Amino acid sequence: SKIEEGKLVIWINGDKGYNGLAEVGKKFEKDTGIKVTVEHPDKLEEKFPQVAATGDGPDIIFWAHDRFGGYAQSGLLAEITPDKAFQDKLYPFTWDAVRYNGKLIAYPIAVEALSLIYNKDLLPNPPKTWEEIPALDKELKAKGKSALMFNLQEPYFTWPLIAADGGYAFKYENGKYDIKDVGVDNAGAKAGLTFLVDLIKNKHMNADTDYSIAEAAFNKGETAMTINGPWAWSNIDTSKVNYGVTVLPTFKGQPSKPFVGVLSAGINAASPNKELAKEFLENYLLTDEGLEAVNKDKPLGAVALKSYEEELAKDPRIAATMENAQKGEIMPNIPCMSAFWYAVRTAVINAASGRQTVDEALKDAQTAAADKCYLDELVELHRRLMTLRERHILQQIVNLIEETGHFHITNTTFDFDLCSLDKTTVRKLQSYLETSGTS
Amino acid sequence: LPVAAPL
Ligand SMILES: OC[C@H]1O[C@H](O[C@H]2[C@H](O)[C@@H](O)[C@@H](O)O[C@@H]2CO)[C@H](O)[C@@H](O)[C@@H]1O
């Protein structure tokens, strides 16, 4: 109704190969007659849920998988229905990233991880550790250059260092991703954020460095190193910098742990072109020729399609992408990921600016992210409990609540508040419900 | 999040 029928509108981030994708759209148009329009609006990961909630937006949305769980929970994405033959063409782990509540909600395209990118002319052997970067910066500053510049405004770029000694922020429990009790607040994360803030205090980095500033400095030969994903490689090729792409530096002997995003393509639930979207994604884009057209414009990283990934396997930059991906953490796709990112973004900005100490910044981020994630799991458990009818199951839930004493009885009901329960009681209800055969 | 079960 609001979205035009008989054509496809695709949204993809401005840093990705939207011109290469438009070439795949011209191939679709040449074969089928259907026009494909590719757009890259600003802040599309936020603009998409705003317009799709009103039945508007693109037919197809491209973004890393982390945001798709939140879109699916709001009813914004159509369930995808590839057959076994198509599913067998992509790596099984890529399908896991786009599965939400038992259903596939997007087509996985590529596996993205940040790497350390360095200028071989300024730095033939890149540093293996973060600890050696302050003295390296001093040496390069005497020659008119800096050691490292990377986007400090987005938590995606600073998280690898924070999590190097901090470890993974999330864990899998009772059929769901849960943020750890100290996934953001631990001493290792505090050490990582302190190291980053100390780099700024010692004038080795600037708190206002953003994506454009870092990209221009590296591509103009002003800084020996940057941190970026595969999409950035084309702009460095154009600049003629002799670069290497390698493992991120270690911190306290621990590998840096980037969040691994699976660039994925979802179909808007309001689209009147769901079958055309499926044909374009399965038969045009997710082929060697389709992925090559996008890849030639801006590299995708380690693609989800087995056949084309084998043709990209010999690229040393992809081997580095995969090595960093293995050391990092696959992003969860739960709806609270939005709150997790807002909280870490705020902690890094406040620590780097002196608004808060490192300890206060991460303690507050842990509270904000864990409260939102826990609230979502409580809302879901409340929904789940309210549909149960079977006597044995209800008796056992009530038996578990009775052990705590956190309940009240009225003339007609047995009452309790999920918010007044301890997390161990909530975990026992979740564990019992997982065994009851009900969902 | 109050839950009510039939008594
Ligand atoms: O910084 C938080 C941000 O991180 C990720 O976004 C990445 C994205 O995955 C990459 O494809 C690339 O475009 O850079 C982005 C960071 O600027 C999460 O995917 C995103 O939801 C999150 O807000």
Please tell me the distance between residue A263's alpha carbon and the centre of ligand 1 in angstroms. Answer: 10
Q: Are residues A233 and A148 in the same domain?
A: yes
Residue A8's Cβ-side half-sphere holds a number of Cα atoms within 13 Å equal to 31
Amino acid at A135: A
Phi then psi for residue A277, to 5 deg, are: -60, -45
Helix (H, G, I), strand (E, B) or coil at A74: coil
Give the separation between CA A16 and CA A232, rounded to whole angstroms. 9
The residues facing A8 across adjacent strands are A36
Q: What is the CATH number of the domain that holds A393?
A: 1.20.1270.290
The residue contributing the CA closest to ligand 1 atom 23 is A341
Ligand 1 atom having least distance to the Cα of A112: 11
Closest-CA residue to A28 (of A280, A297, A272) = A280
Please tell me the distance between residue A65's alpha carbon and the centre of ligand 1 in angstroms. Answer: 10
Q: For A262, which DSSP code? A: E
Element (H, E) at A357: none
Please tell me the total number of residues recorded for chain B in this structure: 7
Give the separation between CA A213 and CA A229, rounded to whole angstroms. 16
Residues in CB range of A43: below 8 A, 6 or more apart: none
Amino acid at A418: L
The residue contributing the CA closest to ligand 1 atom 19 is A64
Q: Are residues A160 and A51 in the same domain?
A: no
Give the separation between CA A434 and CA A439, rounded to whole angstroms. 8
Element (H, E) at A70: helix A68-73
Residues in CB range of A225: below 8 A, 6 or more apart: A116, A117, A118, A119, A123, A126, A147, A148, A149, A150, A218
Residues in CB range of A137: below 8 A, 6 or more apart: A146, A147, A148, A204
| Gaps in chain A with C–N over 2.5 Å, residue before each | none
Please check whether residue A340 lies inside any domain of the structure.
yes
A15 CB-contact burial (10 Å; exposed 0-12 / middle 13-18 / buried 19+):
middle
Q: Which residues of chain B are within 8 Å of residue A418 when distances are taken between CB atoms?
A: 1, 3
Write the residue in A379, A412, A416 that is nearest to B7 by C-beta: A412
Please check whether residue A298 lies inside any domain of the structure.
yes
- Whether residue A385 and residue B4 make contact (CB cut-off 8 A), yes or no, is no
Please check whether residue A1 lies inside any domain of the structure.
no
Element (H, E) at A176: strand A176-179
The residue contributing the CA closest to ligand 1 atom 3 is A156
For every residue of A103-168, DSSP letters joined together read: EE-SEEEEEE--EEEEETTT-SS--SBSTTHHHHHHHHHTTT-EEE----SSHHHHHHHHHHHH--
Amino acid at A148: L
Please check whether residue A3 lies inside any domain of the structure.
no
Closest-CA residue to A139 (of A216, A23, A220, A225) = A225
HEC letters along A41-64: CCCHHHHHHHHHCCCCCCCEEEEE
The residues facing A39 across adjacent strands are A11
Give the separation between CA A367 and CA A181, rounded to whole angstroms. 9
Q: Is the CB of A23 under 6 A from ligand 1?
A: no
For every residue of A288-347, DSSP letters joined together read: HHHHHHHHHHS--SEESBHHHHHHHTT-HHHHHHHHHHHHSEEPP--TTHHHHHHHHHHH
Give the separation between CA A324 and CA A17, rounded to whole angstroms. 22
Please check whether residue A382 lies inside any domain of the structure.
no
Test site for ligand 1: of A12, A71, A156, A330, most ligand atoms within 8 A of the Cβ: A156
- Show the CA angle centred on residue A250, arms to residues A248 and A252, nearest 5°: 160
Closest-CA residue to A67 (of A285, A254, A251, A261) = A261
A84 and A92 Cβ atoms separated by less than 8 Å: no
| B 1-7: CB under 8 A from A | 1-7
Please check whether residue A2 lies inside any domain of the structure.
no
Q: If you search the block for the tokens 């494909």, which residue do you land on?
A: A36
- Whether residue B6 and residue A413 make contact (CB cut-off 8 A), yes or no, is yes
Amino acid at A173: E
Q: Are residues A210 and A324 in the same domain?
A: no
Give the separation between CA A429 and CA A163, rounded to whole angstroms. 31
A264 and A303 Cβ atoms separated by less than 8 Å: no
Q: Are residues A106 and A124 in the same domain?
A: no
Q: Which residues of chain B are within 8 Å of residue A398 when distances are taken between CB atoms?
A: 5
Q: Are residues A143 and A180 in the same domain?
A: yes
Q: For A230, which DSSP code? A: G
Q: Are residues A363 and A291 in the same domain?
A: no
A275 CB-contact burial (10 Å; exposed 0-12 / middle 13-18 / buried 19+):
exposed
A118 and A246 Cβ atoms separated by less than 8 Å: yes
Q: Are residues A32 and A165 in the same domain?
A: no
Q: Are residues A20 and A100 in the same domain?
A: yes
Sign of the C-alpha dihedral computed for residues A117, A313, A301 and A248 taken in this order: negative
Sign of the C-alpha dihedral computed for residues A78, A81, A86 and A89 taken in this order: positive
Q: Are residues A22 and A79 in the same domain?
A: yes
Closest-CA residue to A349 (of A182, A151, A164) = A151
Write down the H helix ranges in A354-422: 358-387, 391-404
Q: What is the CATH number of the domain that holds A232?
A: 3.40.190.10
- Whether residue B2 and residue A416 make contact (CB cut-off 8 A), yes or no, is yes
Please tell me the distance between residue A391's alpha carbon and the centre of ligand 1 in angstroms. Answer: 46
Please check whether residue A156 lies inside any domain of the structure.
yes
- Whether residue A378 and residue B2 make contact (CB cut-off 8 A), yes or no, is no
CA–CA distances in Å: residue A345 to residues A63, A333, A341, A351, A369? 19, 18, 6, 10, 11
Q: Is the CB of A155 under 6 A from ligand 1?
A: yes
Q: Are residues A232 and A355 in the same domain?
A: yes
- Whether residue B6 and residue A414 make contact (CB cut-off 8 A), yes or no, is yes
Ligand 1 atom having least distance to the Cα of A155: 1
Q: Are residues A100 and A130 in the same domain?
A: no
Q: If you search the block for the tokens 């509108």, which residue do you land on?
A: A9
Please indicate the experimental technique that yielded this structure: X-ray
Phi then psi for residue A416, to 5 deg, are: -155, 160
A109 and A285 Cβ atoms separated by less than 8 Å: yes
Q: For A77, which DSSP code? A: B
Measured in whole angstroms, how far is the alpha carbon of residue A66 from the centre of its chain? 4
Q: Is the CB of A261 under 6 A from ligand 1?
A: yes
Give the separation between CA A181 and CA A42, rounded to whole angstroms. 34
The residue contributing the CA closest to ligand 1 atom 16 is A156
Pick left, alpha or beta for residue A287 (phi over 0 → left; psi -120 to 50 → alpha; otherwise beta).
Answer: beta
Structurally, chain A folds into a number of domains equal to: 3
Q: Which residues of chain A are within 8 Å of residue B2 when distances are taken between CB atoms?
A: 415-417
- Whether residue A413 and residue B1 make contact (CB cut-off 8 A), yes or no, is no
Please tell me the total number of residues recorded for chain A in this structure: 439
Q: Are residues A352 and A204 in the same domain?
A: yes
Tokens found for residue A360: 């206060």
Sign of the C-alpha dihedral computed for residues A212, A214, A217 and A219 taken in this order: negative
Element (H, E) at A274: helix A274-279
Give the other-Cβ count within 10 Å of A427's Cβ.
15
A209 and A151 Cβ atoms separated by less than 8 Å: yes
Please check whether residue A422 lies inside any domain of the structure.
yes
A239 CB-contact burial (10 Å; exposed 0-12 / middle 13-18 / buried 19+):
middle
Its domain, for residue A192, covers 115-257+336-374
A419 and B1 Cβ atoms separated by less than 8 Å: yes
